[PDB]
Structure formats: structure tokens, C-alpha cells
Amino acid sequence: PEMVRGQVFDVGPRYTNLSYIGEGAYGMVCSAYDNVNKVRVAIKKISPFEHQTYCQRTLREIKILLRFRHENIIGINDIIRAPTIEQMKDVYIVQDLMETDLYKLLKTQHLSNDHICYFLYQILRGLKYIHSANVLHRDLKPSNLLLNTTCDLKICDFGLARVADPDHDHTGFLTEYVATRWYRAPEIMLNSKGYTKSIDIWSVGCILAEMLSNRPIFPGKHYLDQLNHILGILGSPSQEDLNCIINLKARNYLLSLPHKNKVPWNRLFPNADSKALDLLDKMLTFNPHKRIEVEQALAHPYLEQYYDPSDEPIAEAPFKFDLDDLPKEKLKELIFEETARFQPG
Numbered sequence: 001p002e003m004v005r006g007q008v009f010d011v012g013p014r015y016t017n018l019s020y021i022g023e024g025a026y027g028m029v030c031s032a033y034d035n036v037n038k039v040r041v042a043i044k045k046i047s048p049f050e051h052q053t054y055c056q057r058t059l060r061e062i063k064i065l066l067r068f069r070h071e072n073i074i075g076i077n078d079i080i081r082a083p084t085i086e087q088m089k090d091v092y093i094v095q096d097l098m099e100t101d102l103y104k105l106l107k108t109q110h111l112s113n114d115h116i117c118y119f120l121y122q123i124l125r126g127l128k129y130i131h132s133a134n135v136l137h138r139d140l141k142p143s144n145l146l147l148n149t150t151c152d153l154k155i156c157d158f159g160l161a162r163v164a165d166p167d168h169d170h171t172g173f174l175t176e177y178v179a180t181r182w183y184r185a186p187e188i189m190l191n192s193k194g195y196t197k198s199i200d201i202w203s204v205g206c207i208l209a210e211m212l213s214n215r216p217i218f219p220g221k222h223y224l225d226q227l228n229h230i231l232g233i234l235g236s237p238s239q240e241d242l243n244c245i246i247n248l249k250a251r252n253y254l255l256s257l258p259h260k261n262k263v264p265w266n267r268l269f270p271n272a273d274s275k276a277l278d279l280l281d282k283m284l285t286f287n288p289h290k291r292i293e294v295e296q297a298l299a300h301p302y303l304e305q306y307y308d309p310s311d312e313p314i315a316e317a318p319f320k321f322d323l324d325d326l327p328k329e330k331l332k333e334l335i336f337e338e339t340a341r342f343q344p345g
């Protein structure tokens with residue numbers, strides 16, 4: 001058994017010569033030499049079985065990523081675990097190893113307009129596929145966009161993903177939410193559970209803005225401050241957009257705020273391509289019904305050099321699970337079944 005940073009990595013014989021990459025709440029990640037394909041790969045060790053929420057994230061990730069097949073979506077190559085449920089305490093998920101991510105790149109590198117254009121195209125091309133499967137990613141952000149040394153981009157981390165459910169989207173004002181604060185659409189804080197495709201478009205809009213300036217556009221410091229930052233740039237919502245918020249707590253909160261004018265994009269982003277700012281505006285629309293969709297975004301003049309719907313594939317079938325009430329002991333069973341194809345035979 002190889003060890004890395006006070007942690008067993010029971011991934012052999014196939015995977016050797018481990019180097020530490022990182023760690024987080026999810027577990028730990030290393031690169032390893034794959035002795036079948038003769039490449040280094042990313043391997044993340046997940047130890048989720050003592051927490052139902054970690055089992056949920058693990059199962060969503062595995063189920064979604066094994067179904068999906070797309071150039072701009074990270075795949076799963078292999079899954080290593082014990083041969084029995086009883087002996088299974090860890091799951092190792094093997095994925096293509098990528099050089100860096102967009103969070104890291106934005107902290108250190110100015111992006112040319114051509115880089116911004118290519119990254120955005122790739123994000124939207126991947127998202128077209130995700131949305132075509134009736135799936136919402138729900139946590140799109142720079143650290144979930146992986147990059148290789150030739151700037152090929154792959155969306156990762158589907159642990160918060162869901163099947164779209166627009167007819168159950170409505171909730172009350174200030175309802176708690178899990179996905180990353182800075183990339184949350186304004187409606188999350190007002191009347192949405194984040195069960196529509198428009199939640200992901202907002203996040204992409206925020207990423208686009210962050211590409212233009214290397215700084216998050218709406219860096220809120222707590223739940224309602226996120227709405228403060230959004231309205232600080234978009235300005236007060238129109239009467240029409242307010243009328244779509246039927247919940248009185250949410251509407252009356254908005255009506256209580258002093259009138260704020262829209263900050264023009266070309267003042268926040270003086271060096272940006274005007275077509276990029278036009279698409280930005282459409283992605284960062286307050287009213288989610290008026291927000292541009294993924295396929296429209298791809299057809300936008302900013303992306304004309306890349307746009308090709310015949311080369312922007314969709315999923316063969318809409319995705320459906322066979323649940324959020326299930327005990328961590330049942331989710332372990334499902335993780336066991338779902339990983340079985342990677343065992344000898």
C-alpha cells in the first residue's frame with residue numbers, strides 16, 4: 001500500500017508512483033502512473049460512508065459522470081474499491097489528469113480576448129450537453145473548470161448536480177442554499193431552489209466577468225450580501241421583473257431598497273470586447289425567464305468563430321436517477337452496484 005500524506009492509497013497494482021496534488025472536504029487527490037494506459041492520471045480518494053451527504057455527492061458524481069461522454073466534461077476512467085461491501089471503506093475515482101484549473105489560472109495570468117472566447121465556448125459547449133440531459137450542474141465556478149497545457153477545458157464536480165425540476169422551483173425568501181456564494185443567481189436569495197437551467201447560466205455569466213478582470217464580479221461575504229453586490233451592478237429591478245416575484249417577503253424586501261442605477265458593463269470592463277459584454281449582459285439578467293439559454297449563448301455573435309451546432313453534441317437520452325431521503329447505508333449499496341463494472345470481469 002502506497003502512502004502519501006498520512007493516508008493509505010490502495011490503488012495498485014495498476015496505479016503507481018503517486019504524487020500529492022491536493023485535498024479538501026471531498027478527500028484527497030494524487031496523480032499516479034497508470035501502468036495499463038502508460039499516462040499519469042488523477043486519483044481522488046473518497047471516504048464518504050460515515051456521512052449521508054458525502055454518499056449523496058459521491059453517488060451523483062459517479063452516476064452522472066459514467067453516463068456522460070463529452071470532450072468538455074471530465075470522465076471517470078476507473079473506480080477502485082474493495083471486492084465486498086463489508087470491506088469497502090474507500091472509493092478511488094480515476095480521472096484524466098489536468099494541468100490546472102481556471103481559479104488558479106485567473107489568480108496568476110491575464111487572459112487574452114482569444115483565450116476568454118475559447119474558454120467560454122468550451123464551458124457553454126459542455127453545458128449544452130449537460131442541460132440536454134435535463135441535468136443542472138449547480139456549482140459552476142472557476143475551480144470546477146479544469147485545463148490542460150493547450151487550454152482544453154473540462155467541467156468537473158457533479159456532486160451538487162440535479163435533474164431539472166422547474167415546476168418545484170419556487171420557495172420563500174432567504175431559503176438556505178449549498179452551492180458557492182459568489183456564483184449564486186439573485187433568485188436563489190429571493191424565491192428559487194435552483195432547480196432550473198437558468199441557475200447555471202448565471203454562474204457562467206459570473207465566470208465570464210471574472211475572466212474579463214481576474215476578479216470575482218459579486219464577491220458577497222454572506223448570504224444576503226450576495227444580493228447587495230448583484231443589485232449594486234445591475235441596479236434596481238424593473239416593475240415587470242418585480243411583478244414576477246409573487247412572494248411578498250421577497251418583493252417587499254426589494255421595494256424597501258433605495259433606487260440604484262445600473263453600472264454599465266463597459267465602465268466595469270473598459271478593455272473588453274463589446275460582443276463579450278453584450279453576451280455578459282444576457283447571461284447576467286436579473287429575471288431568470290429573460291436570461292439567455294445555453295443554445296442561444298452559443299449562437300451569440302461573440303462566439304461566431306467557434307459556433308457549430310453540428311459539433312456541439314447533445315446527450316442520447318435525458319438523465320434520471322432511480323433520491324435525497326435514502327440512508328447512508330442504502331447509498332453505500334448503490335455506490336457498490338454503480339462501481340461494479342470496474343472490478344475484474
Ligand SMILES: COc1cccc([C@@H](C)NC(=O)CN2Cc3ccc(-c4nc(NC5CCOCC5)ncc4Cl)cc3C2=O)c1
Nearest residue numbers: 026029042054057058061095097098099100101156157159
Ligand atoms: C464536498 O464533499 C464531497 C464528499 C464526497 C464526494 C465529493 C465529490 C463529489 N467531489 C469531488 O470529487 C470534487 N473534486 C475534487 C477534485 C480534485 C481534483 C480534481 C482534478 N484535478 C486535476 N488537476 C489539478 C492539478 C492541480 O491544479 C488543479 C487541477 N486533474 C483532474 C482532476 Cl479530476 C477534480 C476534483 C473534483 O471534481 C464531495
